[PDB]
C-alpha cells in the first residue's frame, strides 16, 4: 500500500539545466508558429495532443527540464496545444518505463506516433500517473546530468521501479 | 438413413460400439476404459429399449419398413396393449421406449453422465461425436418417427420438460466450467436439449436449421480449441491459458467467428434458431413456468461461457507454465515459416467455416423465406408457429425485446465488470459512463433529431 | 541467434510492416496518410486561423496541474485539509450526474418507461448496486479538520452528482479492520471495492456511517501529523 | 539440443500388490499391471456421501428455484398468451383422422374367412371407447382452432356493423 | 445487494460440478452394484442357493 | 528409418536435460531469494542450510523451481534432497513428462 | 381481376392430380393459398434462380406477378391464423375495443402486461 | 508435439510409426479394384432402387405401377 503522501517541495535559486529540445528552443507559442521547424513538429503533434484529450492517456511532451538539487525537483516545460506550461517534479516520484508501458498504458490503440518521439526516454511519474517523453533532437547536460542527486545509486528502488506500475 | 428399422438397429449398435472405441483409443490407461465402459453401459441400455420398441412394433404390424411403419401406426393409434397388470396405450408405450434410447443417445438429464466422460478420447473424435453424428441419434429418431410421437402423450408432456431442464442445466454447467472440453460438451448437451423443446414445438424445419448450426460451429469450435489444448502440452484447462493470442493468431480469430455464430448472439447466423424456438414454443403445458423459465436461462447461458472461454484462453494475463511460452518466443523459430499450427489446420477450419455459412444460408432461404421452397416432410401436423414469423404481432415483438434486453445487460456485465484491482479501474468506470451517455444520445439523435 | 539473413527467400520486417496495426512496434516510418503527415503537409492546417482554433478550442493548460503539492481551498477559515481525491471522485460525479439526463430524458424519451424502470431494477441490485452505487455512496471526496470543534469535515457525492459536507467528531472516529467486514460485504468488495483502500476503512461509531478514502488520492503530511490526528 | 536418453521404461512403473485382493471387492477394481484404479471415480470427494451430496445439491439448487421464479414473474406481469394451435384450414386431416378413427371402428370388423375370432381377441387390441392419451391434447387444439375461427367471425361482424353504421349516419344527414 | 453468497467458490464448485448429480448417481451404482452383483448374486445366490 | 535388425534401449546419458544448464538455472532461482546473501558461494555441493536456505524457505525455492522446470516433485523426493548436487540431479535425470 | 386473396391471376383451381404432378408440401398444402402457390412454383421451375438470388431480389425478379397473388393470399392466410389484425387493434385501443368490441371473445381474456403501459 | 518416439520390437506386428515405402503402388492397387467392386455392388443394386414421379409426373390410379388391394 503505497500511498500519496505530499511534502510541500520549493524551487531553488540556481537550477542545472538538463534537457533542451533542439527544436521549440525559441519561448512562446508564437516563436514556435514563426520558426519553421517548430511550426511542422508541432502539426506532427497535434495527434498527441488529440491523444491526451480525447483517449485520456495522461502524457507530456518535455522540452527545457531543469534540476534543483537543492531541493531535488525537476521542472518541466510541456508544450501542448495551447502553450507552454510549467510542472514540477520530485525525483522520488519519477521511475523510467518502457516505450511498450507507454503505449499499452492507454487502451485506446494510439495514432501512428512521428519519428522525433524518444523512445527510450520515456519516463513515468507514479504521483501523477503520468508519462514524459522528451524529443530524439535535443541536448543533454552531461554535468547536469550526472549530478550526485540524480545517481541510480541513490535514486534506485527495486520495488518501485519495477512493481509499481503493472499494467497487464 | 436406414430403409427399415433392422438397418436401423445394425446403425444404432455400429455407432455405439465405434463410439465406444474412439473413447477407448488411449488403450494402455484403464482409466480411459472406466468412461469408455460407462458410455458402453449407456449405450447397450439404449440398444435394449430401441430394441424393444422395434418388438413391439413388429408384433403388432407384420412389418418393419418404415415408411410402411409411418403410413400405419394412424390406424393401430387406438390400440392399447395388456401388460403385466396394466392395459398400456400402444402409441405411448412405443413412443416411451424410442424417447428413452433417444434421451440416452442425446445425453439429456440424467442420462448425460457418460458425455463429460466422453471427453478423454482425441479432440477430432470428440467434435464428431458430439457435433452432429452420435449425440443427434435421439434427434434423428424422432424426426424419422415424427408420425408416432405426434399422437404420443408421453411425448407431448416430456419432450418439451426434459428438453428445457436439459438446456438450462447444460448451459448454467458450461457457464461455470473451466475446462475447454467440458465447457463445450456441456454446451452440446444444452443445445440438445434446446433441439428437444424445438422438435415439441413441432416445426422440424426449425429443427433441422437449428441442427445444421449447432453441428458445424460446435465442430468448428472444437477444432479450435484442440489447436489450442495442443500447443498448451494437453492441459485442457484455461487457468493454465493466457495470452495465446499472439501465439495462435488464426485460432483466436477463428473461435471469435465460430463462437459468437455457436452461442446464440445478436446479428449473428446462430440468433435465428434461437429466435424460431421462442417463436414455436407452446403455451398449453401444465409445467409451462418451469419449461420457460429454464429455456430463458438457458438461453441466456451462452454469453458468460463464450465469454469465459475466449477471453481467458487468449486475451487474459499470461497464467500458463513459463516453459510454453519461452519454448516458442526463442528468436531462432523467427522465419516465414513459423506458426505453432498446421496450414493444412487453418485451411481445414476456414474451408468448413465457409461452407457451413453457406449451407445455413441455403437452409434459411429454402425455409424461412416468403416463398417456401422446402422438400415435403411427410408429416400432415402443422403447428401455425409460421405465423408468428410471417406476421407477428405487436405483444410478441415486445415479448422478445425482453429476452434481447436481458443478453444487453449481461453482455455489459462480462464486459465491463472488473473483479481485479488494475491500473484502469477508473477509467474503466469512466468509459461505462461514457458509452452509456452516448447510447442514450445516438438513439435520441437516430430516433427524433435524424 | 537469427538466421533469416542466410536465405533469400525469407521473410523480411519490410513483410511484418502490415503486423504494426495489432504489433506495438516503435515508429519506424510516416505512411503519406498518416495524421502527423497529412497535418504537416496540407498547408490549410499551417493557416492561424487552424492554429488559433487550436490554441482555443479545447483543455485548457490552467486546469492541467503544475506540481506534486496540492493546497486546496479551505473549506472553513479555520480549518486544515488532509485527504482529497483527484480521479475516482470525478469519476463518480460524472457517473452519478447521469440521473439528472438519462433518466428524465429516458421518461420524456423511452415509449415503455415502466419496461425500462423493471429493466433497471434488478439490474440495480445485482451487479450496480454494490459495484458503483454503495462504494460512492461511502465514497470521501475530500476530508478537512476543523480544530476549534476538534471534527472533520468529509465531503460525499450524493444523487444527481450533488455535493454535501457533513462533520463528525475525531472522538467517535473508530478502525475497522478488513476482516471484520469482508464476509459482510464481500459481494461489495468484490465488483466495486478495488477503487478505494482495503485497510484503510475508518467509520463513526455514534452514526455507523463508514469512510472509503482513493487509493490514488492525495494526502498531507503537515494534516496527518497535526496533533489533534495523533 | 540435448541428445536426450531413450524413452524411460520407469514411464509405466510396475504395480507391485501390498493388500489381499478380496473376493467382496470381485471386479469392483480395474485391475492393471501399472496403473489399477477403482471402477468409480469420485472427484467430488468433499462431500462425504450421497446423503450429504443431495442435501448440498438442493441446499444451492434453491438459488437457481429463486431465479426461475424471479424471470417467469417478470415474464407473467409483463406478457400475454398467444394464438396458437392446429391451422383452421387443416382441420380435415390430422385432427380428422384421429377423430374419424373412432368413428369407423374399422378394428372390430368381423374376419374376412368368417373366423369366429374378431378384434379383442389379442394382446394388442383396439379400445374405441377410449378418452384418454392425446385425447385431452387433440381436444383442446380442436377448442383453440374454433375459439380462432369464432375470434375472425366476431372480428367481421364488426367491421360489417361498423360499415352499417356509417352508412347510416352519412344517410341521415 | 451487497453480500452475495453465489459468487463465493463453495456455490462456484457445486454448479461447476454439474451439481453434484454424476456423483450421486455414481455412489448409487456403487451400491446396487455391489449389493445385486456380489452378495445377493454370487455369495448368496451362487454359495447358498446353488 | 530404423534398420530391419535388431536396436536395442539406448540410455546415452542418465540425464534427460542439460545437467548444466540445469544446475545454472536453479541456481539463479536460489539468488533471487531475499534470505539468500552471497550467490557466489552457491556451489553443487553446498547444503541449504550452508547457503543460507531454510527449512521454510526450501518449500518455496522448490515450489518455483517446479514452476521453472515444468515437473512436479513429490515431498518424498525434496525431502530426500540435501545438497544442489543432489537437486540437480534428480531434476536432470527426471522425464519432464514422468 | 377483382378476386379474392385465394384466387390467382386466372381464377383457375387445380386438381388433386395437378397438385401432385406440381407436389406442393404439406406445409403449404394445408393452407387456402395452393391455387396462388402453384403459379409460383411453376415460375421458378421454368426459370432456376441461385438461392443467393431469391434471398437479395425482393421483388423475385422474373416471377414477380404471381408472386404478388401469393404474398398478398400469405399474408391473410397467416393474418387469419395468428388473429393478428384483431390482436393489434385491442393492442393499440383496449379502452375503445372493448367499448366496440372487436372480438368479446378475445377481449374477455386479454391482457397487455404492465410494462407495456405506453 | 507428439510422444518422443521409442523402439519397437522387431518380432512384434504393431503398427507404431509404420511408414511404407511402396505407399503409392499401394494406394493405387487398393483404391482402383475397391472403385470397380463397389461399381458392381451399385449397378447390382440399381435393379431394386425406388424414385417418386418427377415433376411433370402423375400417377394414373388404374395403372399397374399404382397400388393394388388384396383381393380375397
Ligand atoms: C473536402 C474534404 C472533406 C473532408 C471531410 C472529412 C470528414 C471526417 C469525419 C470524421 C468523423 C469521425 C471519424 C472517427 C474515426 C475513429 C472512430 C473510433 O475509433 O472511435 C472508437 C474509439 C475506440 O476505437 P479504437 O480502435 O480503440 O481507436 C483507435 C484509433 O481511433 C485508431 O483507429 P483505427 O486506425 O484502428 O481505425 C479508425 C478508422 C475507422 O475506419 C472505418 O471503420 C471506416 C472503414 C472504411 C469505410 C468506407 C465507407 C465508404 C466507402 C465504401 C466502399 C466504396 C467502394 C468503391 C469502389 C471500390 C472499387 C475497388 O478511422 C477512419 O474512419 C479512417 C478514415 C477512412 C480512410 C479510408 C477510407 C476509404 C478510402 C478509399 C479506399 C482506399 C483505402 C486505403 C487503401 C487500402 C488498400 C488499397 O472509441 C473512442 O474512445 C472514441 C473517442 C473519440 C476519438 C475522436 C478522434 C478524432 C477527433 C476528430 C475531431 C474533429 C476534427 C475535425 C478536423 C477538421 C479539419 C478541417
Ligand atoms: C394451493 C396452494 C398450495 C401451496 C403449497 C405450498 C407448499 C410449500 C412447500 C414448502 C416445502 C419446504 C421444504 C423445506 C425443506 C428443508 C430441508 C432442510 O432442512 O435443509 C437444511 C438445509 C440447511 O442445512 P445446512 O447443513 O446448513 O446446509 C448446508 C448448505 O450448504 C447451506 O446453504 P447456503 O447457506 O450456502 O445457502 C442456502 C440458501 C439457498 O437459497 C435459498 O433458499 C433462497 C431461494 C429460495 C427459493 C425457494 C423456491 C422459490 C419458489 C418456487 C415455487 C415452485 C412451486 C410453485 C410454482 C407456482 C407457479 C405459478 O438458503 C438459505 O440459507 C436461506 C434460508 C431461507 C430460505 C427461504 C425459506 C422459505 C421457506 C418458506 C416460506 C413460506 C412463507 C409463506 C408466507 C405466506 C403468507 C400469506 O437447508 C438449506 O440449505 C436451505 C433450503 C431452503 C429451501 C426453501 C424451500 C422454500 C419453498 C417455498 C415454496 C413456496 C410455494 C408457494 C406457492 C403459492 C401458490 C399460491
Ligand atoms: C461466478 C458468478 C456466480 C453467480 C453471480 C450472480 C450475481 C447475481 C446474484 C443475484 C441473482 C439472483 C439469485 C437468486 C436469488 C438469491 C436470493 C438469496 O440468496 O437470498 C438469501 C437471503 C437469506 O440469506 P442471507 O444470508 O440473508 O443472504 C444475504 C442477502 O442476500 C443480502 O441482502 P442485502 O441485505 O444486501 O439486501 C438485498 C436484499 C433485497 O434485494 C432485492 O430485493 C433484490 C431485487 C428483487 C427484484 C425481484 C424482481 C422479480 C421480477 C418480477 C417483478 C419486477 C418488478 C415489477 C414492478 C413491481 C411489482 C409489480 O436481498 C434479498 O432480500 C434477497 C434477494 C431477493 C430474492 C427473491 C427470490 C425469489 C422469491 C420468490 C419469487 C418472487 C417473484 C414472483 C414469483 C411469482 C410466482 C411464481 O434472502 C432470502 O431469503 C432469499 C428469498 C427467500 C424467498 C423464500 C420464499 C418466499 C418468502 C415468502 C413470500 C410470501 C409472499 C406472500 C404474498 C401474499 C400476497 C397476498
Ligand atoms: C409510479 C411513479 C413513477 C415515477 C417515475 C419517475 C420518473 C421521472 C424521474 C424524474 C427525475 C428528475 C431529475 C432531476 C434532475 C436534477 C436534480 C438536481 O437537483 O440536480 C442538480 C444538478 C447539480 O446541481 P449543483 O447545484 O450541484 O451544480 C450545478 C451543475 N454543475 C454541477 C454542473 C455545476 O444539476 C444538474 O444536473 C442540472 C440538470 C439540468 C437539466 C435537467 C433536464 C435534462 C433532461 C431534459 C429532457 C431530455 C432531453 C430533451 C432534449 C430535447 C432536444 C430538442
Ligand atoms: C420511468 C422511470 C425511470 C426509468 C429510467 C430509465 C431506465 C434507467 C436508465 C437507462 C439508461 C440506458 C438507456 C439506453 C438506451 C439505448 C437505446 C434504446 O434502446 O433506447 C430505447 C429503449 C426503450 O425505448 P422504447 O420503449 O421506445 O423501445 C421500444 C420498446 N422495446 C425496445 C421494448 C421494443 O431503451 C431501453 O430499452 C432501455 C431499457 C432499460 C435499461 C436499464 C439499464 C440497463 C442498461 C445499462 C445502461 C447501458 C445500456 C446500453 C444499451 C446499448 C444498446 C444495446
Ligand atoms: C429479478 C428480475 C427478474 C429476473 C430474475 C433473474 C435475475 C438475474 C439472474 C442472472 C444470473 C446470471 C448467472 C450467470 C453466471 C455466470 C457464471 C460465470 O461464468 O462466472 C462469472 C462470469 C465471469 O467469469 P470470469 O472468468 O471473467 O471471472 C470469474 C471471477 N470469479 C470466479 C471470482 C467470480 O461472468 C460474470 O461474472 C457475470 C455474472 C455476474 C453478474 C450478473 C448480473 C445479472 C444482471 C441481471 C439483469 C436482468 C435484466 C432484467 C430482465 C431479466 C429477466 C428477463
Ligand atoms: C428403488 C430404487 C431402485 C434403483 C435402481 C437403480 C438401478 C441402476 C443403478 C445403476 C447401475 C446399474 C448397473 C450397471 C453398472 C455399470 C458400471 C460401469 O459401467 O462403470 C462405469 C462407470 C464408472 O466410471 P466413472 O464415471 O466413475 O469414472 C470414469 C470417468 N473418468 C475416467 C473420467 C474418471 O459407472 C458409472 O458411473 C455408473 C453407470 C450408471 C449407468 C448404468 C447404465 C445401465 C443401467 C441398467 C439398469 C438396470 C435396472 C434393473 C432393474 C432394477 C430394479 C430396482
Ligand atoms: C483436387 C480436387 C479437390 C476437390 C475440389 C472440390 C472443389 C469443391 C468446391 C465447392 C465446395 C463448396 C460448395 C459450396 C457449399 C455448398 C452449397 C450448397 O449447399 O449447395 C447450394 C448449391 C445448389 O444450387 P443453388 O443453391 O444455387 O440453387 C439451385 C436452384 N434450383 C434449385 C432452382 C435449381 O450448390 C452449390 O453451389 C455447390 C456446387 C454445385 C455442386 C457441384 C458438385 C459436382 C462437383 C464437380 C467437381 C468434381 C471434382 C472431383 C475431384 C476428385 C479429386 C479426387
Ligand atoms: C462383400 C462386401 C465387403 C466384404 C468385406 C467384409 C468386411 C467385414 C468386417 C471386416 C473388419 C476388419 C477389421 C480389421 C481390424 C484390423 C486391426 C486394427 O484395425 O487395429 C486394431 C487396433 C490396433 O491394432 P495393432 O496396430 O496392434 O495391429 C494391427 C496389425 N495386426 C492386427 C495384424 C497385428 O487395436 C484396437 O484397439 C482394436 C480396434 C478395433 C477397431 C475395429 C473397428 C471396425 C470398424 C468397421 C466399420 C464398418 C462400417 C460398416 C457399415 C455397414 C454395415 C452394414
Same mark, same amino acid.
Given at each position: ?87 514540477? !517534479? ?79 | ?58 408384433? #403388432? ?222 403455451? /398449453? ?145 469512466? /468509459? ?19 | ?34 495524421? #502527423? ?116 469535515? !468529509? ?76 | ?173 | ?50 | ?81 540435501? #545438497? ?15 | ?77 397467416? #393474418? ?39 | ?72
Amino acid at each position: 500500500n503505497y500511498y500519496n503522501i505530499m511534502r510541500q517541495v520549493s524551487l531553488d535559486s540556481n537550477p542545472i539545466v538538463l534537457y533542451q529540445s533542439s527544436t521549440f528552443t525559441g519561448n512562446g507559442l508564437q516563436e514556435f508558429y514563426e520558426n519553421a521547424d517548430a511550426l511542422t513538429k508541432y502539426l506532427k503533434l497535434v495527434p498527441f495532443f488529440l491523444e491526451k484529450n480525447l483517449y485520456d492517456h495522461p502524457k507530456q511532451f518535455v522540452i527545457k527540464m531543469e534540476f534543483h538539487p537543492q531541493n531535488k525537483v525537476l521542472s518541466l516545460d510541456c508544450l501542448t496545444h495551447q502553450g507552454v506550461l510549467k510542472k514540477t !517534479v520530485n525525483l522520488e516520484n519519477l521511475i523510467p518505463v518502457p516505450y511498450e508501458d507507454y503505449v499499452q498504458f492507454c487502451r485506446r490503440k494510439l495514432f501512428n506516433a512521428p519519428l522525433f518521439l524518444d523512445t527510450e526516454m520515456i519516463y513515468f511519474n507514479t504521483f501523477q500517473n503520468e508519462f514524459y517523453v522528451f524529443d530524439k533532437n535535443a541536448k543533454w547536460n552531461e554535468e547536469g546530468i550526472n549530478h550526485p542527486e540524480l545517481d541510480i545509486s541513490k535514486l534506485y528502488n527495486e520495488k518501485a521501479w519495477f512493481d509499481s506500475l503493472r499494467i497487464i | 438413413s436406414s430403409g427399415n428399422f433392422i438397418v436401423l438397429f445394425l446403425g444404432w449398435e455400429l455407432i455405439g460400439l465405434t463410439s465406444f472405441f474412439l473413447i477407448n483409443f488411449w488403450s494402455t490407461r484403464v482409466g480411459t476404459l472406466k468412461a469408455a465402459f460407462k458410455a458402453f453401459s449407456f449405450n447397450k441400455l439404449s440398444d435394449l429399449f430401441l430394441f424393444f420398441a422395434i418388438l413391439i412394433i413388429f408384433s #403388432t404390424t407384420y412389418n418393419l419398413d418404415i415408411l410402411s411403419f409411418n403410413n400405419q401406426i394412424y390406424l393401430y393409434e387406438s390400440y392399447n396393449i395388456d401388460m403385466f397388470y396394466w392395459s398400456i396405450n400402444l402409441i405411448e408405450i412405443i413412443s416411451f421406449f424410442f424417447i428413452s434410447c433417444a434421451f440416452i443417445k442425446s445425453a439429456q438429464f440424467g442420462a448425460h453422465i457418460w458425455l463429460p466422460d466422453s471427453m478423454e478420447a482425441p479432440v477430432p473424435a470428440s467434435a464428431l461425436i458430439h457435433s452432429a453424428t452420435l449425440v443427434s441419434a435421439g434427434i434423428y429418431l424422432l424426426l424419422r418417427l415424427s408420425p408416432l410421437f405426434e399422437l404420443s402423450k408421453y411425448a407431448y408432456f416430456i419432450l418439451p420438460l426434459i428438453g428445457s431442464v436439459t438446456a438450462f442445466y447444460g448451459g448454467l454447467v458450461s457457464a461455470f466450467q473451466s475446462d475447454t472440453k467440458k465447457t463445450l460438451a456441456y454446451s452440446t448437451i444444452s443445445h440438445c436439449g434446446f433441439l428437444m423443446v424445438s422438435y415439441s414445438t413441432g416445426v422440424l424445419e426449425f429443427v433441422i436449421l437449428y441442427l445444421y448450426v449447432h453441428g458445424f460451429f460446435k465442430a468448428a469450435t472444437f477444432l479450435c480449441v484442440g489447436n489450442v489444448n495442443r500447443f498448451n502440452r494437453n492441459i485442457q484447462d484455461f487457468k493454465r491459458m493466457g495470452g495465446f493470442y499472439k501465439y495462435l493468431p488464426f485460432e483466436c480469430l477463428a473461435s471469435f467467428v465460430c463462437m459468437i455464430n455457436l452461442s446464440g448472439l445478436p446479428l449473428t447466423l446462430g440468433f435465428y434458431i434461437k429466435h424460431l424456438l421462442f417463436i414455436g414454443l407452446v403455451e /398449453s403445458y401444465t409445467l409451462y413456468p418451469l419449461i420457460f423459465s429454464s429455456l430463458i436461462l438457458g438461453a441466456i447461458a451462452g454469453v458468460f461461457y463464450s465469454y469465459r472461454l475466449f477471453y481467458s484462453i487468449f486475451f487474459d494475463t499470461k497464467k500458463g507454465k513459463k516453459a510454453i511460452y519461452l519454448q516458442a518466443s526463442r528468436i531462432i523459430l523467427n522465419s516465414k515459416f513459423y506458426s505453432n499450427t498446421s496450414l493444412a489446420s487453418n485451411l481445414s477450419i476456414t474451408f468448413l467455416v465457409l461452407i457451413s455459412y453457406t449451407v445455413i444460408l441455403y437452409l434459411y432461404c429454402t425455409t424461412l423465406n416468403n416463398y417456401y421452397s422446402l422438400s415435403d416432410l411427410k408429416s400432415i401436423y402443422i403447428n401455425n408457429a409460421y405465423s408468428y414469423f410471417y406476421k407477428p404481432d405487436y405483444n410478441f415483438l415486445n415479448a422478445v425485446s425482453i429476452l434481447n434486453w436481458f443478453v444487453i445487460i449481461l453482455l455489459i456485465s462480462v464486459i465491463y465488470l472488473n473483479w481485479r484491482w488494475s491500473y484502469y479501474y477508473t477509467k474503466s468506470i469512466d /468509459s461505462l459512463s461514457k458509452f452509456i451517455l452516448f447510447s442514450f444520445f445516438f438513439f435520441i439523435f437516430s430516433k427524433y433529431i435524424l | 541467434g537469427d538466421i533469416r539473413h542466410k536465405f533469400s527467400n525469407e521473410i523480411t520486417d519490410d513483410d511484418y510492416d502490415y503486423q504494426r496495426a495489432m504489433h506495438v512496434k516503435p515508429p519506424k516510418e510516416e505512411s503519406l496518410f498518416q495524421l #502527423t503527415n497529412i497535418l504537416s503537409s496540407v498547408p490549410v492546417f499551417k493557416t492561424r486561423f487552424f492554429l488559433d482554433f487550436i490554441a482555443r478550442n479545447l483543455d485548457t493548460n490552467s486546469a492541467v496541474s503544475t506540481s506534486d503539492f496540492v493546497a486546496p481551498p479551505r473549506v472553513h477559515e479555520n480549518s486544515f485539509f488532509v485527504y482529497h481525491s483527484r480521479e475516482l471522485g470525478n469519476v463518480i460525479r460524472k457517473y452519478r450526474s447521469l440521473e439528472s439526463i438519462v433518466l428524465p430524458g429516458a421518461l420524456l424519451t423511452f415509449t415503455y418507461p415502466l419496461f425500462a424502470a423493471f429493466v433497471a431494477i434488478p439490474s440495480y441490485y445485482f451487479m450496480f448496486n454494490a459495484k458503483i452505487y454503495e462504494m460512492s455512496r461511502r465514497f470521501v471526496v475530500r476530508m478537512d479538520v476543523l480544530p476549534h470543534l476538534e471534527m472533520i469535515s !468529509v465531503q460525499r457525492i450524493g444523487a444527481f452528482g450533488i455535493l454535501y459536507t457533513k462533520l463528525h467528531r475525531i472522538q467517535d472516529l473508530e478502525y475497522v479492520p478488513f476482516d471484520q467486514v469482508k464476509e459482510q460485504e464481500n459481494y461489495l468488495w468484490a465488483i466495486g471495492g478495488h477503487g478505494v483502500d482495503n485497510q484503510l476503512i475508518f467509520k463513526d461509531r455514534s452514526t455507523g456511517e463508514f469512510f472509503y478514502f482513493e487509493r490514488q488520492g492525495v494526502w498531507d503530511a503537515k494534516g496527518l501529523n497535526h496533533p489533534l490526528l495523533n | 539440443g540435448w541428445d536426450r536418453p531413450d524413452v524411460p521404461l520407469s514411464f509405466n512403473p510396475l504395480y507391485v500388490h501390498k493388500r489381499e485382493l478380496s473376493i467382496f471387492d470381485t471386479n469392483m477394481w480395474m485391475y492393471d499391471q501399472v496403473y489399477p484404479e477403482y471402477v468409480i471415480s469420485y472427484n467430488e470427494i468433499h462431500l462425504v456421501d450421497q446423503w450429504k451430496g443431495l442435501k448440498e445439491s438442493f441446499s444451492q439448487s434453491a438459488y437457481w428455484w429463486a431465479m426461475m421464479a424471479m424471470v417467469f414473474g417478470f415474464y407473467f406481469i409483463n406478457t400475454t398468451p398467444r394464438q396458437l394451435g392446429i391451422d383452421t384450414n387443416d382441420l380435415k386431416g390430422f385432427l380428422g383422422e384421429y377423430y374419424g378413427q373412432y368413428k369407423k371402428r374399422s378394428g372390430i370388423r368381423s374376419n374376412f374367412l368368417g373366423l369366429d375370432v374378431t378384434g379383442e381377441n389379442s394382446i394388442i387390441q383396439p379400445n374405441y371407447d377410449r378418452k384418454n392419451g392425446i385425447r385431452d391434447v387433440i381436444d383442446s387444439l380442436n377448442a383453440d382452432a374454433g375459439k380462432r375461427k369464432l375470434i375472425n367471425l366476431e372480428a367481421k361482424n364488426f367491421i360489417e356493423r361498423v360499415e352499417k353504421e356509417c352508412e347510416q349516419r352519412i344517410l341521415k344527414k | 445487494m451487497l453480500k452475495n453468497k453465489l459468487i463465493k467458490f463453495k456455490f462456484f464448485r457445486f454448479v461447476q460440478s454439474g451439481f453434484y448429480v454424476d456423483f450421486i448417481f455414481k455412489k448409487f451404482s456403487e451400491m446396487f452394484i455391489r449389493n445385486i452383483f456380489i452378495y445377493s448374486s454370487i455369495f448368496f445366490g451362487e454359495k447358498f442357493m446353488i | 528409418y530404423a534398420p530391419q535388425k535388431v536396436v536395442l534401449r539406448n540410455e546415452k546419458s542418465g540425464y534427460y536435460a542439460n545437467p548444466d544448464d540445469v544446475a545454472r538455472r536453479l541456481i539463479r532461482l536460489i539468488s533471487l531469494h531475499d534470505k539468500v546473501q552471497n550467490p557466489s558461494a552457491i556451489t553443487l555441493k553446498s547444503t541449504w542450510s550452508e547457503i543460507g536456505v531454510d527449512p521454510l524457505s526450501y518449500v518455496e525455492i522448490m515450489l518455483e523451481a517446479e514452476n521453472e522446470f515444468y515437473i512436479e516433485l513429490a515431498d518424498e523426493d525434496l525431502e530426500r534432497f540435501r #545438497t544442489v548436487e543432489d537437486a540437480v540431479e534428480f531434476i536432470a535425470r527426471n522425464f519432464f513428462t514422468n | 381481376g377483382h378476386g379474392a386473396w385465394n384466387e390467382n391471376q386466372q381464377h383457375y383451381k387445380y386438381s388433386k392430380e395437378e397438385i401432385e404432378a406440381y407436389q406442393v408440401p404439406m406445409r403449404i398444402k394445408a393452407g387456402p393459398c395452393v391455387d396462388t402457390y402453384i403459379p409460383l412454383k411453376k415460375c421458378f421451375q421454368e426459370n432456376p434462380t441461385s438461392f443467393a438470388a431469391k434471398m437479395l431480389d425482393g421483388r423475385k425478379g422474373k416471377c414477380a406477378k404471381e408472386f404478388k397473388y401469393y404474398n398478398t393470399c400469405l399474408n391473410h392466410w397467416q #393474418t387469419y391464423e395468428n388473429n393478428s389484425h384483431v390482436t393489434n387493434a385491442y393492442w393499440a385501443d383496449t379502452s375503445k375495443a372493448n367499448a366496440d368490441g372487436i372480438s368479446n371473445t378475445y377481449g374477455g381474456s386479454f391482457r397487455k402486461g404492465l410494462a407495456w403501459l405506453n | 508435439g507428439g510422444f518422443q518416439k521409442y523402439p519397437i520390437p522387431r518380432y512384434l506386428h504393431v503398427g507404431q510409426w509404420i511408414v511404407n515405402k511402396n505407399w503409392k503402388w499401394n494406394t493405387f492397387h487398393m483404391f482402383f479394384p475397391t472403385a470397380i467392386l463397389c461399381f458392381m455392388v451399385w449397378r447390382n443394386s440399381m435393379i431394386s432402387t425406388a424414385k417418386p414421379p418427377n415433376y411433370g409426373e402423375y400417377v394414373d390410379p388404374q395403372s399397374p405401377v399404382a397400388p393394388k388391394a388384396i383381393k380375397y
